[PDB]
């Protein structure tokens, strides 16, 4: 089971993320079911948009909304829905939506998976266009869903992101 | 496990379908294995055809052939093999094949997944070309497999389709 | 050459559209070069969005921005960049950008190409979600290019769309 | 222009084919317009089928239906619509539709393009399932367009295929 | 679980292979996790190459490196990562890498899945180009990974391949 | 026609490149025919490799092999075969094959097309893994075509790349 995946091999610097939606995919919003470990279609998205990075969660974590910690993972090629990426957090995008405070971490693959990100220490080391694409996507992807809305607060750095990982791992027990 | 997925949140009007073959996919006929929950390649299809809608089954049901209830689900984008769609049945295509009586339900996504189908109450509310494509596909997709054949009987409406859902759920126990 | 293609077989009710950007495609804004007839990359789009319908122009027409008349064509499957679709206008989206006023027609394939659009005579006969997606796309796709803005004025019907074809055809003479 | 391309470097044994519809593609029936050289959408195909091989024509030939000679080209990977393949005929599928008699050649890439077809000298040297798929495709792909019918007469060998090339080349003079 | 899949319905002539990497896929090297049954991204491959055949392993086997028996499966269309193919071994490619002796079997689908391979009894019955592509891929796919290397020994036939299947099945207990 | 396209808007710093083979594409080596302007299949590549960047040529240039100047263009998304990209050279890969000496430029999109390459002025400003992939690709892609060989001499900077553009432009006069 996915529950047999640890939150990471090494604390917050070295974590696992289970991908629910590949980057640059069809506008199908998948979510993994806790009981099933199965990929559920939560909705077909209203707007003509795609996730700018792979979107998933850290197994064995618990966030404020009761669900695992949300993470976007940047990769050189989109990964398969349901697959698991060893990665490293570099930032945190603060938002609020219809459901309350909702933050998304952003992460890059571990050095064992690729050398492309060795010099990416903070989200500000990612391309500025990609950061703006992530802000813009979350500001607008729910625009055509009645009863859903998003407000962007701002970004925080890698240390805060790792802080949220530790909090969510302990909240899981 | 897939067996931890109920046949639906609400009886026959609101059901879950596990997708084995996405719409418009490569001509690979996948089937989910009961013991494994794993996707098995049952065959590479002989004819140069594709499923006109996503093809799967309702978990926790039992049909006449001993297997779960077959369902085709219409969606705006093909969904991933192995994913689970909350949907609503609108019709039933009656057929017989080498194995005996074989009916396929047809369904559209629940209102929470998309607004595109709110006015689709009966299979006759779907495009006539799509209905004819479904009849034509099942009449011919086995034409190049020795020892396999299909005869189409005809279509029945949404109430009959929901009737078959209830029958298969009770047969599962 | 593309200039050999008339605006239509029959006036404004039966027109041809040369596609530049397929529906549901990667975020590459191609434009056909008037002289070479070759497909140029105008830009990689800044936002994580995709054209909700195929986008192109009517040959041998002239609009106010000095270019042929813009048209979105709804199709059951996205069509190749550079290919030509016989279609019929059903609506017009009014808007203006920084460059001035700018409208896009919306159209559907001629009945010889597909039976699926027989009952679509006005843009309001298309799914409401699609109309909303087209409007949302043009409102936001340029949000990440500095200085660019688009305000939506609203939709107009098929008669108005055909009027704009008549006008743009004569402007090309 | 496409008219600058000869029927072949060497007669009927070494020909060129301009591809209109790639193998394994979406069900869009493209046809190249004689005048503009542009790829037109002739129709969206009614049935849930795909061309089992790349489909196109030999430039500077003339058949009985007043159009260049039709040829299917088997390739290890589907080739782009509008591209040109140096190939060699190995068979001919005889049939007639409502429009009259109609035959398609089948061909394989010249040995300069791939070594994979060295031992394919007759269509019977291709996998039997492919030959059956081509026959099944042309028997059924038009089943959902009213009034259209196709009856298969049978296959003929490479010598007959080369005879039809010789003939169609002279008809174009 | 994948562990509920037998090594095959019938010994070494009729085996199951769980696919980790589809043929002709993105250069993402997936591996199934023993504890999770989940697909892990082991790395993004350095070189600009793709697996020439589907790559997976036989469930319920144990090889020298402690892992299940590696198998490449040739199919007419790439199969989904995580899916299971009933197949039949036809050869064995001997190699050594940074980790020690590493052999890969090669297999074709069982007759129930496709008729395309009935006459393929030995790996030498596969196209010579495909055999050379497999040798070339494994000789070079690690060229841009520091600390990884591969040396090709040579090929062995179907009987040796089935011999390795039996050895690995018994080693699993 | 493609001949109407100048080598660039501005000399060697601002050039156009006509793409023949998109990045990350199937292993089909297309070449544009000088006369017909049509995309020909030159060969199906023997090795299981793909071009790591889009590959094409500068119009209205002449190299030593009697063909226009070869250029690889790095883009955020692969671009369609036959399309034209406004770009800027940043490096040159020196090598020779059996045919003689042969160099490829590497280039990035003009800032009007994308902001992502502002700080890329020399090829050493691209990810090191990409530079290594390009070198590895050209060293090995022809390994399975008998008699063909390529030896890499090394990379040179942007000034040298622009020198080769100046030279090839005058050779075309
Ligand atoms: Mg989440
Ligand atoms: Mg959340
Ligand atoms: Mg949210
Ligand atoms: Mg079934
Ligand atoms: Mg059944
Ligand atoms: Mg059946
Ligand atoms: Mg325009
Ligand atoms: Mg315009
Ligand atoms: Mg505009
Ligand atoms: Mg034809
Ligand atoms: Mg014809
Ligand atoms: Mg015909
Ligand atoms: Mg392995
Ligand atoms: Mg191994
Ligand atoms: Mg190894
Ligand atoms: Mg070249
Ligand atoms: Mg060259
Ligand atoms: Mg060369």
Residue numbers in the entry:
A (entry chain A), B (entry chain A), C (entry chain F), D (entry chain F), E (entry chain A), F (entry chain F): 1 to 173
Paper text:
Here, we solved four crystal structures of a family I type PPase from a strain of the pathogen Acinetobacter baumannii. The crystal structures of AbPPase showed that the enzyme has a typical Rossman fold domain that is highly conserved compared to other PPases. Family I PPases are hexamers formed by two stacks of trimers.
Structure 2 was solved from a crystal produced in the presence of Mg2+ and PPi. In this structure, three Mg2+ ions (M1, M2, and M3) and one PPi are bound to the catalytic center. Na+ was not detected in Structure 2. However, the space group of Structure 2 is H3 in which there are eight AbPPase monomers in the asymmetric unit. With this information, we set up the crystallization conditions to contain PPi and Mg2+ at a ratio of 5:1. This indicates that PPi in the AbPPase catalytic center can fluctuate and interact with different amino acid residues, Mg2+ and water molecules.
